[PDB]
């Protein structure tokens, strides 16, 4: 016998004590070793309701990642409100590692294994585990990176699809590589991401076909963001400790979906920025210029964050723009199939 409850989780990882890389240092202190023998138990004839948007595990992961960045990526200059803090800001070794979330004694985690589960409602194929799978705390906007993939069809996730203030998460079932480089020396802040146009456009066509299912076969259109901070109007992420901002206008190109001059490599222009708005929500930070040499991150695009235009009530089409900003949604994109219960 069990019931929905919230409690204090602990983390587990394969972090290395000798490693200088910052996620490793954090997890060596904060976490235990990965379950040497993970076993999940299928709950026969059991149906359980889930709600990925009201899942306190997400809150706890957000706290960890904020704590990790706070002690490893402190800005040389922090501007919060009007007060200026100056502190050291050495370059670091930075590359996210998988972190598992695990329940304390007297609690367990239920896991939804329905292959087209959208994050809310009833789940027919349920199992219990002691820990989630290993989740990398990748912070990004617009595109979800290095995450897990939908196993069957592309899945659309939203707390309320008709609520245009709610972010939509698209969960891909096939990843598309994005290859971002700041070349070794020259503008030291000029960088770019390369994506295979053919692959990306095929996926994006399937995404529109899935979206059509949720909006009455209406015409689906992508457009670039209409406003906001650069962290959200651009694909924002951290590669090797450096903050990237990439322009995704070419990535959401309707002309290609459905013409053929699109196949080929898509080169998005990016810039490294020393002065950023902190996704933590805590204000403006200023870092030192980028390290020398070839700065390169190849990532899997496994998800997309979207905002749908209002004012389309009695129109023939629906318009989507890349979104993000609320990093808790990043963790939701991976934690969606889990919930904590207390064993009575």
């Amino acid at each position, epitope marked *: 016998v069990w019931k929905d409850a919230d409690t204090t989780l602990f983390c587990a990882s394969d972090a290395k004590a000798h490693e200088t890389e910052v996620h490793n240092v954090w997890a060596t202190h904060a976490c235990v070793p990965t379950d040497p023998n993970p076993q999940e138990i299928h709950l026969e004839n059991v149906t359980e309701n889930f709600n990925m948007w009201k899942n306190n595990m997400v809150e706890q992961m957000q706290e960890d990642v904020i704590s990790l960045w706070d002690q490893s990526l402190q800005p040389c200059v922090k501007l919060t409100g009007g007060s200026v803090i100056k502190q050291a800001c050495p370059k670091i070794s930075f590359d996210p590692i998988p972190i598992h979330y695990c329940t304390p004694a007297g609690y367990v985690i239920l896991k939804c294994n329905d292959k087209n589960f959208n994050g809310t409602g009833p789940c027919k194929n349920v199992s219990s585990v002691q820990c989630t799978h290993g989740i990398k705390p990748v912070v990004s906007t617009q595109l979800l990176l290095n995450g897990s993939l939908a196993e069957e069809e592309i899945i659309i996730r939203s707390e309320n699809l008709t609520n245009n203030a709610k972010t939509i998460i698209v969960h891909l079932n096939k990843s598309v590589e994005i290859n971002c480089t700041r070349p070794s020396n020259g503008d030291i802040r000029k960088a770019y991401c390369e994506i295979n146009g053919t692959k990306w456009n095929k996926v994006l066509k399937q995404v529109t076909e899935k979206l059509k299912e949720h909006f009455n076969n209406k015409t689906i259109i992508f457009q670039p963001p209409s406003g906001g901070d650069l962290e959200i109007t651009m694909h924002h992420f951290n590669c090797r400790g450096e903050f990237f901002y990439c322009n995704t206008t070419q990535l959401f190109n309707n002309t290609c979906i459905g013409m053929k001059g699109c196949n080929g490599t898509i080169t998005l222009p990016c810039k490294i920025k020393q002065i950023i708005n902190m996704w933590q929500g805590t204000g403006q930070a200023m870092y030192a210029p980028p390290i020398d040499g070839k700065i390169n991150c190849v990532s899997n695009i496994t998800g997309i964050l979207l*905002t749908r235009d209002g004012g389309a009530n009695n129109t023939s089409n629906e318009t989507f723009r890349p979104g993000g900003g609320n990093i808790k949604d990043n963790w939701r994109s991976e934690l969606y199939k889990y919930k904590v219960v207390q064993i009575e």
Partner: antibody
Amino acid sequence: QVQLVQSGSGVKKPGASVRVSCWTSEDIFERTELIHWVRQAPGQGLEWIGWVKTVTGAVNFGSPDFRQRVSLTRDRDLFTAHMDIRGLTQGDTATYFCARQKFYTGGQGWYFDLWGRGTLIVVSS
Amino acid sequence: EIVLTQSPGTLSLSPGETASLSCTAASYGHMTWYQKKPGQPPKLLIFATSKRASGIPDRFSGSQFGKQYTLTITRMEPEDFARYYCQQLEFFGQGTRLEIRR
């Protein structure tokens, strides 16, 4: 039911631009996730114009016309939200309200618990 | 089609009586309700369909029958005579004008 503060009403010639501003206390702005703008034309109903998220400056609008002509921004340091309207038309004469939506509304839709007193904009030559 | 239909357009009642207003929505969705007096901004009364806002007296209630969302004001006071609007997401109802019957 404290009120949000708004700039004073005024008259604008057709085709001009205007900025309407909305500010409040640090505590309130801190507990505001979105600032919405809603207008009411004389003797008519309420019409949603758009929103801006206070934390990220993200926006959305009630129509292409609004997306085209209205800019929604905020200044987190001064706990203020701005609505810039350009190409003012006679159809834009209305009282414009700013209104607040809290964090964590979950699945219970849109409800604005604090409102500004409204700014009358009269478009006339 | 129309997303919200509010009724009645007008309602005439005596103080102490109970008013029943409805907003019939095309789709299910938590309903909000405002009071609106001339020269003053909307005042939140009910949200999440049936939850009362802070400081709102318990004579104001909200509920629903299927897609028919309803606002009830029992034992009306003078101060309660005004216009009333429902809001579901970005859409507002046409409004109900509640005036004193004599």
